[PDB]
């Protein structure tokens, strides 16, 4: 069995609808449901957690006085079930704020570190879904990468555009370059291959 964290941006910008009938928030919610349905129906043994960033409330183990704010652990590492399907579809809504995606990545790594203790997994995996419009701080990023390597975590980034231009903001361009630096540190030239579109996300998650 493998262990997977789905780390999803629900900040206010994800709710902006200018690429078809579904906003990026709606599209990512849809991919997450299809993936979780596949896992339930095949009776897979993999365990799946869900971390949301950009939420109006704060609920995570690291939140303390202006730190790791507006990040919520919606589902801990467990087998997926039908209650989770109901929650995702009805409860989970867009936030009215924005949050820091490296904060969210650390919350996800801390979750895997604690909740895989003493068990054997074939792989540990974090999948991030975002449009990269929110600002972030790079403080301690070298520590994040060192622990991704030691723990042998496989990382995948999914974006609602491929990388005529798309009108990406400077903040989005900075986020994309930071994703490239992270993936090259882990896997080299081949590492940049592990950056994908929402369109291709369901199939890449599954292999």
């Amino acid at each position: 069995k493998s262990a997977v964290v789905l780390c999803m941006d629900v900040g206010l910008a994800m709710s902006h609808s200018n690429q078809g009938k579904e906003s990026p928030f709606e599209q990512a919610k849809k991919v997450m449901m299809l993936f979780l349905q596949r896992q339930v129906f095949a009776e897979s043994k993999d365990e799946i957690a869900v971390v949301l960033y950009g939420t109006d409330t704060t609920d995570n183990a690291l939140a303390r006085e202006d730190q790791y704010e507006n990040i919520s652990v919606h589902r801990h590492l467990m087998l997926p079930d039908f209650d989770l399907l109901e929650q995702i579809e009805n409860v989970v809504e867009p936030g009215s704020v924005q949050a820091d995606f490296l904060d969210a990545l650390i919350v996800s790594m801390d979750l895997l570190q604690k909740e895989t203790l003493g068990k054997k997994y074939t792989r540990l995996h974090i999948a991030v879904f975002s449009d990269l419009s929110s600002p972030f701080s790079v403080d301690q990023l070298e520590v994040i990468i060192a622990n991704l390597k030691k723990a042998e975590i496989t990382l995948q980034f999914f974006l609602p555009f491929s990388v005529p231009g798309k009108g990406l903001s400077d903040q989005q361009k900075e986020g994309i370059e930071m994703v490239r630096k992270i993936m090259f540190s882990l896997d080299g030239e081949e590492g940049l291959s592990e950056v994908f579109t929402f369109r291709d996300s369901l199939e890449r998650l599954s292999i």
């Binding site: 730190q67 904060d103 790594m109 403080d139 520590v143 622990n147």
Partner: peptide
Amino acid sequence: TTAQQRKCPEWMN
């Protein structure tokens, strides 16, 4: 993008 300080949890030391 900024450099606002953050504290990583102790296990990542």
